[PDB]
Amino acid sequence: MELFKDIKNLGKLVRLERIFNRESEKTVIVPMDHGVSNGPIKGLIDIRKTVNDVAEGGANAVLLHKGIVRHGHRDVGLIIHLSGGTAISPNPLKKVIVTTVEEAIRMGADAVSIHVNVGSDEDWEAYRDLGMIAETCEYWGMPLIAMMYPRGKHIQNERDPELVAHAARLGAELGADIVKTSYTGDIDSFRDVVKGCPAPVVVAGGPKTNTDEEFLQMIKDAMEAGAAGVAVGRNIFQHDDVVGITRAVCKIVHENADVEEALKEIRK
Amino acid sequence: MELFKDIKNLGKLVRLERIFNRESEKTVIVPMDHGVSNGPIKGLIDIRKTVNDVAEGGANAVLLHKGIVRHGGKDVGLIIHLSGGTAISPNPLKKVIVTTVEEAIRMGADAVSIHVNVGSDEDWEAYRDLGMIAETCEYWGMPLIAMMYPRGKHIQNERDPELVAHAARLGAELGADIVKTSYTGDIDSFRDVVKGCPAPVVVAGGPKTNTDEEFLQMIKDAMEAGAAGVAVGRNIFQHDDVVGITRAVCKIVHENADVEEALKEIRK
Amino acid sequence: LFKDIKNLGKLVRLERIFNRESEKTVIVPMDHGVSNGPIKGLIDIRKTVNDVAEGGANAVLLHKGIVRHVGLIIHLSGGTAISPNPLKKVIVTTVEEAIRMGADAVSIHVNVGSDEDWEAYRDLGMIAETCEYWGMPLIAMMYPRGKHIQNERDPELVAHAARLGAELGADIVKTSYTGDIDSFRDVVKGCPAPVVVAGGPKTNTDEEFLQMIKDAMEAGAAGVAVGRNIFQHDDVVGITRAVCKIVHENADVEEALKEIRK
Amino acid sequence: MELFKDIKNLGKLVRLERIFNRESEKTVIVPMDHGVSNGPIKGLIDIRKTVNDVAEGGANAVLLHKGIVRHGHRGYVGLIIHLSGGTAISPNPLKKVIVTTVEEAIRMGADAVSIHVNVGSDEDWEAYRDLGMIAETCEYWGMPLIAMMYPRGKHIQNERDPELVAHAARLGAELGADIVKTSYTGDIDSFRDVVKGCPAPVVVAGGPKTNTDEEFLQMIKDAMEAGAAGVAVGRNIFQHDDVVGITRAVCKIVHENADVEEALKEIRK
Amino acid sequence: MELFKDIKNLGKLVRLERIFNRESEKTVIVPMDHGVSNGPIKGLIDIRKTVNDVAEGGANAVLLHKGIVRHGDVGLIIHLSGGTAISPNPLKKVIVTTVEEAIRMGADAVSIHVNVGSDEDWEAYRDLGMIAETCEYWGMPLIAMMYPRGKHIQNERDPELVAHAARLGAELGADIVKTSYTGDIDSFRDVVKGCPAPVVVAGGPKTNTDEEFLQMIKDAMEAGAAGVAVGRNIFQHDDVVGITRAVCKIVHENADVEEALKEIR
Amino acid sequence: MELFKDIKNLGKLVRLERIFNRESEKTVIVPMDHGVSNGPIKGLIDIRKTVNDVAEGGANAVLLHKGIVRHGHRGYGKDVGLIIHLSGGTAISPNPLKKVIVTTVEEAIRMGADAVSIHVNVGSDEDWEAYRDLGMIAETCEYWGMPLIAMMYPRGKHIQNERDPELVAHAARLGAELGADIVKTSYTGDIDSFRDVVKGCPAPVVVAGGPKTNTDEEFLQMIKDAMEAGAAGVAVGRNIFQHDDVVGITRAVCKIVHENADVEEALKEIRK
Amino acid sequence: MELFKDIKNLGKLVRLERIFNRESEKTVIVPMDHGVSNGPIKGLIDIRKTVNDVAEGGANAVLLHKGIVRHKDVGLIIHLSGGTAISPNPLKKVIVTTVEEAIRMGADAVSIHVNVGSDEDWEAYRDLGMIAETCEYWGMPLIAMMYPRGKHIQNERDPELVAHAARLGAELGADIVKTSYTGDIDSFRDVVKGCPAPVVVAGGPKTNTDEEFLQMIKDAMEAGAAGVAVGRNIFQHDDVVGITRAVCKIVHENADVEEALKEIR
């Protein structure tokens, strides 16, 4: 598997092959950690069902907080989130480490993820968390997915091409094996994010779009820009046909299908 | 016991059984930690007596700070509180960890509890405490009860359906085995709190009500909304008939009795 | 008195600072040096400790540095009047250090209501656990002091402070007398741990001071922990004997005032 | 419980109440750790059932190795986890090594732990140290410690010999065991010496399956008379044709001071 | 997974799902740790190839020492025990690899070898007990290979000693138990029934005919075995991949020796 | 090795030889950690190539963050020493001058690095926290025999001229007092003032390159002068990896640093 | 470097690059740890000089005990094992230096000595396995010197025994194995093929003629050796620089014994 030809860590390779597709060397991750920051939103109320439908649709892995896993009436990959913060907090952009890598390992997870809002108050504390966690991940052979987003007092456009690219880069620099970040709006600027970041980049889905057209076109665009896959939550689990929209996404990501052939998977 | 047929932790499994009624699979917990935050209030002055009356009334467990345990029917389950903060502090909503899980274990406790005011200043620090403590509890097989409340400079209705459901979800997401929280005011909204939280939810009693009618009706409804039990303090230990009011509560919680019958247990 | 205490080491050590047939204690705190500098009576500490011991005090309370030069209680808290935040207290000595010095107990100071006082709440709770493990008696000096507390002797704020200390694990609580026997009796009844009263600033007459001790004992105090009123008095030995008369022998003020010579 | 009127350890107190009967202040423990040392013997093949019947009969606690607890939890008695291991097929069958930690027992929700020391066996001093050290970690965690002390080894011809049995019991108390398990010495007087010479409550072992219920129950009755704080019998209970019944018989004698004749009636033969 | 519905441990459950067949709830493990104790024997010289053929044949997992893994889809079990035939005490086993090392390598389980009856075997009793605890903590499945061997044992397949050896392993914390077949369906059924943990049979030395070997597995399965852990009889065969398919037919599909031999190419 | 003749640390000695030229006893280090603080800037997009060209040009060592190393083409090309950076901070942070430790010395060691580096902005907010980091890391470096390069710069709300002689000299001295083996800092603008920085600092001083200069003349002359002031070498990034001819400009730098060549001879190494 | 393509450890890779010739992917190591086991023997009295001559001759690395490092560039390998000829058990080896100590000294690799077949040799098995893990963590290359030596081994050069010992080292985590030449190209080729780790040959006692020694090295390279680790035959020679150059000719340049001989003055 060429993608991580450079990775010199047996452990990481083994677990990585459980979240990435062998043929395409791309990944479809369904993040479902919104519960912590936004409460029980649409699609994440009956988590057991969502995980099932998404798995059924062909997702390679789900990303959850440890508490949801332990209550799990569990065949896909499991990524455990280590960051926490909420929208009701005096500082909604603050993220602290709420779970350890070791805890994720003893639960059988295949990878862990951390969220860093670059530009938020005292964001340097999160820089250190990422750097340290990257080292403990390296030691345990645990793949690390760093969700890097430009966010704070002075950032008007958390999707700005320069900022998003700087943030993804930062993530690769501090040891992240994979980086999650926002699509910048156009194939060219996002291709810069991809080229400026030594680690594979995976795109976030963002808020639920008005039409499947919009959402699927963005995936196709991101893949074209060089994305190693996708990590979308809301646009999948808040969709009326979760299994269908998931298949659509897989068509685009693993089979290079176009939006038209992709839309045929959605139940009308 | 169906309630926890999802727990893959023998230790927590054995301890939860000491604070949950076998046949009803519900619990009546009497929190008596108010001393730390409010001083020696009514009913918590002669703690030894209160614990006795409450045990006599049929409570499944009492919740105390380590200092009160040392000093003072048959037996009742013991839950040791780990959080501390006071009303006289410059920041009365601040909670710090004052007791360790290990201390609670070597004291023979059956569970531990933490208090998190979601929305309070630097509340993210408490997010981390919960997450970490959840892990040490998982390791020791110690049941963890997380008291989640939406309280802060920008929350005017601490009982707001949305905020409570979010607060309760956080608790479950980060590792609590059980969550005690405020009743939202009506059966429908509270049923949303229960359904949005993967962990069993237990309701708080709130300030002493004017009539037994009010109090018992609210416990009855919470049970109807899907609560796994109750964790009331003031409404029980500040009542004229502690043993009696406790029996009333047990009638409603363990026997599904209606307020009518439940009230007969109170001597006037 | 300590019938509920299930710790062999705390019992053995608590017997060195408590009168056996009276079950009360007279502690002479001499840690003022850290917070106020070399004040009257604490300049020749060696002498003060001697006179106080001579007068019958059960124990002296000092910072490790002074000892390193009756029962011994080592203070773990530090803060000064010249600090930008004079009410701030940080842990400056460990329980282990006190143990290897042969101390019989340790003490911590918590200003409930001071800035970031929650940090001290945690210190007390943690130290209580390490004290429990080592069998080291813990005396928690609880005072409601802060930017919004106009009266630090307020009955209910003081009864809250004492209770807080017991809830978090102190074996003995030091605190201010509330001004009258009834309100202080509430502090005593609301606190599961034995309460000991502080002496406060030097009073104008021995009458005032000894009478307050008497009222506190009457309110249910387990003893006294006075510093300035003893080591700043003109007859250290004598005033200490007076205090012991009241605390250990239930003597009255008029019979106690008689111990003060010169 | 005037039995532990001196245990100055809240944790040990709370946990001891889950294995001793409050009314009688005595205990009926059913050890089922024989699997490790003797293999799957009669009565310990379907452990889940045995634990159930014994619980049904009124036993206060079962004693098992960690590996079996991870199965035998019906959820439908106090749990004591054994920390010692050794086997009959080992070159030194009297050797015992620590195979489980106190911490492991705690995170499993156990109410107590037990250690086995063959006083007089080869390198038995190593076990002396294990007991002494484990006693301290038990003291710290508030975990009750049951020490099974038996005089066994090359120079010990009679293992139920009163002077040695009592020396062993004294050994476990001196080093910190909360409770002592040992063999009955054969007569009420000599065993009363074991009890009086040991500061810790003593509980008697059942020994090999007896030929008649008469023999066994009488032995229990005598031991109680000598001052035993209860009983810890395995084979004589789980290898019986009516586990539930024989267990009730034992409880009658231990918790209700019943006599053998009254107790035998409980055996649904 | 009906086989471990009692294992109140998430990590073990997740990792065991990578060693056992969901449909049959049985396992075919190919141990290849012989190198340490016997040197580079037949079939274990070109280990890379053997692992491939065995994987190709349908084996659920391979069992190796850490060094072999690091020098170059099935499950991976890392052996923690070491000892050699050239040692003054060939039955001695010491722990040569840690559970943590196995975890950071991505292994799905670890295994330990205990010769019950060997000199100072009690030291290995302790190793098993301790390692079981560290495995419980990490959610790492533990396979304990229990064999009765030592000075007072000549029949290392006696139904008594084997059943005890297996029981011992389960009592002390292992999640699965590897052991020798006792020679007949009835005695082995006693080993299975006396051991709370799933038992898996060892293959023993290379048999003269495929008939002998495959019949041995068909019997063990009949006795109640949860699967098989055979090395020599598979990697020392002339058709590694075919004999492996034969084994899988018997273990996962309950096929008979007749319809099984038709796999060995 | 004469300049490190006062280092009673075998490991440090062994490791410093893999970053310094035996004969000139000077060093040419190419820092490439800009990615963390400024994002993927010119020349640091295809890092694998840059490391190669710089190695080809004769650089003694490259300085990178742990993440960039792992993603490497660590193959044949011409072995060069590896220095791993331990400090992190970004231009998009509310406090762009803040630096926190993002990598440990132990991690650098198990990666085979020959040295580690830390960045301290003396004068920045809560800079005392970084003082402590330097002091502590110096001790762990001393224990592991890992050479420590401290990049000391005067930057803050009250420093308008970060090349100020008295300030640079203070910052460089600071690094040496707290245990750094080598100190990286800005050139002060003239040979005399910089010679004061060098003389006031017990540790060998290496100069930073600063932003890309308009002409090769400016840059190379600056280096030539710093060497004259007593610098132990150079640690330039942008002026090398952002130059059209990397391999060439690097050779130019080596000519000046290792061979005492003059600016005019040096320029002869830069392609058309 | 082709030799270590399956080695997923950045640190080891880098440190091995310093003890191996990049073009020949072979190594010439000069062990000089004899002092501990045999005292100050010929050639190891003025160690400073020997290290210099050997470095001068082109050796890739020297292997020493920490005490000697303390009191042309060349890689440094620090020995971790100790035992002496005057000890009641001369074959006993205990760990006398830690991997961490070697790292803080700037070493490029560490080595351990295991006499397979010696009394309580299983204790050394464990040392190797444990040290292998700490080496893996620190990115420190580990060279395991595996030799068949005990009261039941008469020919410590026996093909079966040596291949077994070398395979033992690889299995437990050694990166490179040092062992005795078995006497002929075919049997030694079996040692090389049976061991997943690169094998390097020991020089043995000083030979009577340079012919004997150089021919031995030549056959070993032909058998597939990854290099040589000879001490006595180099530092006890009359022309150290010369004999070392001879060895390098054969190992790095595939030169024949006739041509190699030249370098000797």
Phi, psi of G263, rounded to the nearest 5 degrees: -45, -20
Cα–Cα distance, C188 to C196 (Å, whole number): 9
CA distance B127 to chain D (A): 24
Name the residue among C96, G163, G171 with its Cα closest to residue E78.
G171
Whether A13 and G13 lie within 8 Å, measured CB to CB: no
Active site residues of A: 33, 149, 180
F49, F90, F104, F109: best mutation site toward chain A, by most A Cβ within 10 Å? F90
C residues 192..251 contacting D (CB < 8 A) = none
Q: Which helix (H) or strand (E) holds F205?
A: strand F205-208
Query: B174 at the A interface (CB within 8 A)?
Result: yes
Written as six digits, the tokens of C173 are: 């609580």
State the Cα–Cα distance between residues G154 and C114, nearest whole angstrom: 82
Shortest Cα distance, chain G CAs vs residue F118, angstroms: 20
Residue pair B161/B192 in contact (Cβ under 8 Å)? The answer is yes
**Residue C143 is assigned to a ligand binding site:** yes
Q: Give the residue from A59, A115, A63, A54 showing the smallest Cα distance to A84.
A: A115
C-alpha dist (Å) from residue G189 to B81, B83, G162: 69, 69, 11
Is D20 an interface residue toward B (CB < 8 Å)? no
Chain E CB within 8 Å of residue D97 CB: yes
Q: Which of D13, D14, D109 lies at the smallest CB-CB distance from B11?
A: D109
* Known catalytic residue at D222: no
Closest residue of E to A78, CA-based?
Answer: E14
Best of G74, G103, G108 to disrupt the F interface (most F CBs within 10 Å) is G103
Set of chain D residues whose Cβ sits within 8 Å of the Cβ of B17: 75
Q: What is the DSSP letter of A201?
A: E
Distance CA C173, CA E235 (A): 75
With the CA atoms of G118, G119, G125 and G126 taken in that order, what torsion angle do they form, in degrees rounded to the nearest 10?
Answer: -160
Q: Is the alpha carbon torsion for E1, E2, E4, E8 positive or negative?
A: positive
Please, which residues bridge with residue A26 across strands?
none
Q: Domain tally for chain A?
A: 1
For F100, the closest of A124, A172, A197 (CB atoms) is: A124
- Name every chain A residue with its beta carbon within 8 A of the beta carbon of F92: 118-119, 150, 152, 155, 163, 166-167
Q: Within a 13 Å sphere around the CA of E147, how many CA atoms are in the beta-carbon half?
A: 21
H helices of G145-235, in order, are 159-171, 185-194, 210-223, 232-235
Instruction: Name the residue range of residue E3's domain.
Output: 1-265
We report the CATH number of the domain holding residue F72 as 3.20.20.70
Whether chain A has a CB inside 8 Å of the CB on E20: the answer is no
Give the closest of F35, F67, F90 to A176, CB-based. F67
Strand partners, B77: B61
State the chains in contact with D (3 or more Cβ–Cβ pairs under 8 Å): B, C, E
**Which residues from chain E sit within 8 angstroms of residue A106, using beta carbons?**
11, 137-139
Task: Please pick, among G178, G210, G219, G249, the residue that the annotation labels catalytic.
Answer: G178
| Distance (Å) from the alpha carbon of C188 to chain B's nearest alpha carbon | 10
E69 touches chain G (CB under 8 A): no
Query: E strand or H helix at A116, and its extent?
Result: strand A111-118
Q: Is F114 one of the catalytic residues?
A: no
Which is catalytic among the residues B149, B177, B221, B251?
Answer: B149
Cβ of residue B92 closer than 8 Å to a chain C Cβ:
no
Contacts of residue A246, defined as CB under 8 A and 6 or more positions apart, other chains included, come to A28, A30, A53, A54, A56, A57, A58, A59, A236
Torsion, Cα of D87, D93, D95, D96 (10° steps): 30
Between chains, do D10 and C6 touch, taking CB under 8 Å as contact? yes
Q: Does G172 touch chain E (CB under 8 A)?
A: yes
Number of neighbours of residue A9 by Cβ within 10 angstroms = 25
Helix count (H) and strand count (E) of chain E?
Answer: 12, 10
Structure determination method: X-ray
Distance from CA of G73 to the nearest CA of F (A): 10
> Known catalytic residue: G147?
yes
Inter-chain touch E151–D91, beta carbons under 8 Å:
yes
Q: How far apart are CA B116 and CA B130, in angstroms?
A: 8
Q: Which residues of A touch F89 (CB under 8 A)?
A: 124, 127
Q: Does D71 touch chain E (CB under 8 A)?
A: yes
Query: Which residue among A67, A91, A100 sits closest to B174, beta carbon to beta carbon?
Result: A67
C171: nearest CA partner in chain B: B67
Strand duo C90-91 + C77-78: pairing: antiparallel
CB G12 within 8 A of CB G6: no
Select from G12, G14, G20 the residue whose CB has the most chain F CBs within 10 Å, as the one to mutate to test that interface: G14
- Which residue's structure tokens are 């006075």? C226
Residue C73: C-alpha distances to residues C16, C29, C67, C132, D194 (Å): 10, 9, 10, 16, 44
Residue G15, helix vs strand vs coil = helix
Nearest CA in chain A to E107: A11
C12 touches chain D (CB under 8 A): no
User: 10 Å Cβ neighbour count for G47?
Assistant: 18
Instruction: Report the C-alpha gap between E168 and E171 in whole angstroms.
Output: 5
Write down which chains contact chain E via at least 3 CB pairs under 8 A.
A, B, D, G
Q: Which residues of A touch E11 (CB under 8 A)?
A: 105-108
Q: Which two tokens stand for residue A101?
A: 């890598």
Residues in chain B: 268
Inspect the interface and report whether the beta carbons of F112 and G13 lie closer than 8 Å: yes
Structure tokens at C126: 């943690």
Q: Locate the chain D residue with the closest alpha carbon to C5.
A: D8
Pick among B1, B4, B8 to test the E interface (most E CBs inside 10 A): B8
DSSP three-state, residue A163 = helix
Per DSSP, A11 falls in state H
Nearest CA distance, G2 vs chain F (angstrom): 10
The tokens describing A92, both together, are: 């909604």
| Closest chain F C-alpha to A131 CA, distance in angstroms | 4
Q: Is C32 annotated as a binding residue?
A: yes
Among E1, E55, E16, E58, residue whose Cα is nearest residue E255: E58
**Probe site for chain D from B69, B75, B79, B107 (most D CB atoms < 10 A):** B107
B154–A90 C-beta distance less than 8 A: yes
Instruction: Tally the C-alpha atoms within 13 A of residue G46's C-alpha that lie toward its C-beta.
Output: 7
Residues in chain E with CB shorter than 8 Å from the CB of D68 are: 170-171, 196
Q: Identify the burial level of B10 via C-beta atoms within 10 angstroms of its C-beta, where 0-12 means exposed, 13-18 middle and 19 or more buried.
A: buried
Q: Which of B40, B90, B99 sits opposite C117 (nearest CB)?
A: B90
DSSP letter at E44 equals S
Distance CA B65, CA A214 (A): 55
8 A C-beta contact, residue E120 and residue E94: no
Which string of b and e fits C31-54 if b means at least 16 CB within 10 Å? bbbbbeeeeebbeebeebbebbbe
Residue in E with minimal Cα distance to D90: E117
Q: Is G265 annotated as a binding residue?
A: no
Query: Are D109 and B74 within 8 A, CB to CB?
Result: no
Nearest to A82 by CA among A138, A141, A28, A147: A147
